[PDB]
Write a protein that binds this ligand. Sequence first.
Ligand SMILES: CO[C@@H]1O[C@H](CO)[C@@H](O[C@@H]2O[C@H](CO)[C@H](O)[C@H](O)[C@H]2O)[C@H](O)[C@H]1NC(C)=O
Ligand SMILES: CO[C@@H]1O[C@H](CO)[C@@H](O[C@@H]2O[C@H](CO)[C@H](O)[C@H](O)[C@H]2O)[C@H](O)[C@H]1NC(C)=O
Lengths: 133, 133
Amino acid sequence: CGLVASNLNLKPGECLRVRGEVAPDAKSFVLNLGKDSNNLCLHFNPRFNAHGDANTIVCNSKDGGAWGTEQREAVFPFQPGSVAEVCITFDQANLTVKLPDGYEFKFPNRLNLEAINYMAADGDFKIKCVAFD
Amino acid sequence: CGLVASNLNLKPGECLRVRGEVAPDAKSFVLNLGKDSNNLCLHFNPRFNAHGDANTIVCNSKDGGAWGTEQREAVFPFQPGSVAEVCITFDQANLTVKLPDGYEFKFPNRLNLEAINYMAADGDFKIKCVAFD
Ligand SMILES: CO[C@@H]1O[C@H](CO)[C@@H](O[C@@H]2O[C@H](CO)[C@H](O)[C@H](O)[C@H]2O)[C@H](O)[C@H]1NC(C)=O
Ligand SMILES: CO[C@@H]1O[C@H](CO)[C@@H](O[C@@H]2O[C@H](CO)[C@H](O)[C@H](O)[C@H]2O)[C@H](O)[C@H]1NC(C)=O
């Protein structure tokens, strides 16, 4: 798979910035955030052409190994063959994901974790820069 | 205790750039690089005042869980309570740790691994930004 980072200790309100290159023939990519691979407060999955979906942002949680209820966003500000940046923060109610074009969406915080300690990237996205504040 | 990153897939000649905050009361900090926590082609350990050393960089390898022989430097361009930036690369012969100001540290490549896949920070160093080039 792709980059895995742990012991991040990202607290509420602190920003996680991730910049990467979207493959020219990208089918999808994933950024997973949470405690570990079984406990994700955000599974962020832009699907260019994957699982039957096209140009769709899919979000979900995973709690104790179990996928939660999936949600989708209508907008898709990713282009294959381009560099994309995503900035993520959270509070007790929502994750807030800020997207390249300045789009911003929220995803409910279903896990109640004190911090984001784990990030994993997968798929057609080559990570170039990760920053914390 | 600090950030741990895996699946880095950093190949010879590629550049790992790291920026972090050296704690105000720093006694020492560590950046570990290699395949995993038991196989380190570079343990890079600036000691302000730790383990009997004062303002000395200690470098070592770890191979199958076994520490190699330490290498020490006289030059010491780190200060507590400051931001430190390093650029790391390797080839067949050496690991090279470069600082913006032009300091360059070399440590023999003892493990001969195809890539750096693992990086970990420990001690009085908070990673703020990691980049791959
Ligand atoms: C039956 O609906 C589809 O189920 C798929 C299998 O669970 C699902 O794909 C998974 O989505 C999760 C996030 O919810 C994650 O991305 C896994 O990698 C996927 O395999 C599809 O998203 C579902 N399709 C719809 C339209 O809901
Ligand atoms: C007895 O000499 C000192 O031994 C310490 C313990 O082995 C050693 O510290 C360890 O070094 C490794 C790297 O080789 C790593 O930094 C560990 O975290 C340390 O606990 C000191 O380097 C030795 N000091 C001297 C002056 O020889």
